[PDB]
Amino acid sequence: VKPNYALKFTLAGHTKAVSSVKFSPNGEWLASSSADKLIKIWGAYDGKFEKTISGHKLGISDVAWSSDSNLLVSASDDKTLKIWDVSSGKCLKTLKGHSNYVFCCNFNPQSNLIVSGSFDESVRIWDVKTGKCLKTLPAHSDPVSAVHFNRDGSLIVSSSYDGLCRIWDTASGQCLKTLIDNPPVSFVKFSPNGKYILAATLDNTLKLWDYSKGKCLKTYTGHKNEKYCIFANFSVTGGKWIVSGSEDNLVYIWNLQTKEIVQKLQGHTDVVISTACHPTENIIASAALENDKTIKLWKSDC
Numbered sequence: 001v002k003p004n005y006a007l008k009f010t011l012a013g014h015t016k017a018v019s020s021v022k023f024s025p026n027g028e029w030l031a032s033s034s035a036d037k038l039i040k041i042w043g044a045y046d047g048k049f050e051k052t053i054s055g056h057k058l059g060i061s062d063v064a065w066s067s068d069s070n071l072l073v074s075a076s077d078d079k080t081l082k083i084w085d086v087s088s089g090k091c092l093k094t095l096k097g098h099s100n101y102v103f104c105c106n107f108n109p110q111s112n113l114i115v116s117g118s119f120d121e122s123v124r125i126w127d128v129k130t131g132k133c134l135k136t137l138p139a140h141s142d143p144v145s146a147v148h149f150n151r152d153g154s155l156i157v158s159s160s161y162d163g164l165c166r167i168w169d170t171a172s173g174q175c176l177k178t179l180i181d182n183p184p185v186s187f188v189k190f191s192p193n194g195k196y197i198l199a200a201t202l203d204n205t206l207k208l209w210d211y212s213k214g215k216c217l218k219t220y221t222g223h224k225n226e227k228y229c230i231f232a233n234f235s236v237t238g239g240k241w242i243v244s245g246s247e248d249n250l251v252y253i254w255n256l257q258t259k260e261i262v263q264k265l266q267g268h269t270d271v272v273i274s275t276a277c278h279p280t281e282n283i284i285a286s287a288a289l290e291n292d293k294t295i296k297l298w299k300s301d302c
């Protein structure tokens, strides 16, 4: 079987490159961040604009939801993260401490912690309630491209231009594993069950790792990725897919097990830097850079 993703909605509004799209855990909303300094919220099913969230002084690289879908965290060129109340649009906390651009961010499942990665080569862990930086991890020797908590929050995975993926004990702050040619690692995330890590490198390659055995189980190629830190995803609502943007302006979909490309989605007119998979429906959101500036919503039967 192969999926049949068809374009349903194009969401215009951002005035610069869109950096990140994320579906809310409860499936109602899509949040988008942009170099235009703005966060925008959209209805996930009808693509209808909901609100604009403003406050950051410079462009925003990433946005992430709390488990209850009530809060957002953003990561900005202004060296801060901000925590937002989604319903009011209000900035609740500004997370200060990174010495350079913040590129990536995530809540833990418990949503009492935030993790962030910066151009400053560190990974920071923040208390959501107080805004205080609890730990600064000397994670990498180059900009940190991605940070993600595993399913139980006990682990953090980080990736960097230094060519390394690292797994950290959240509680102890110590490095549990280093996956080490080492081309820049531009993306990393845990699988839904926490057993695997999907990692992208800037040599046109995505890899699925069993990090406990430290072994590469699958490779996904055929797409273009040598410049931009492009977000990838596990698609699990229907067929079991791998989804990624690409520098040829397409969204690529692979069969996770066989590694064959099952679909390529055309429509965008610039690099697709971010994709998101809806938590319950077979819906993909994709976002493109400055020649495009739109988010597209795609729907499949499997």
Ligand SMILES: CN1CCN(c2ccc([N+](=O)[O-])cc2NC(=O)c2ccccc2Cl)CC1
Residues within 6 Å of the ligand: 017, 018, 019, 020, 034, 035, 059, 060, 061, 062, 063, 077, 103, 104, 119, 143, 144, 145, 146, 161, 229, 230, 231, 273, 274
């Ligand atoms: C969702 N992902 C999170 C991680 N991310 C990222 C990773 C690595 C580096 N870097 O080491 O250069 C830079 C960026 N950010 C930007 O490229 C960017 C920054 C501000 C505004 C717009 C954009 Cl697109 C891209 C989006």
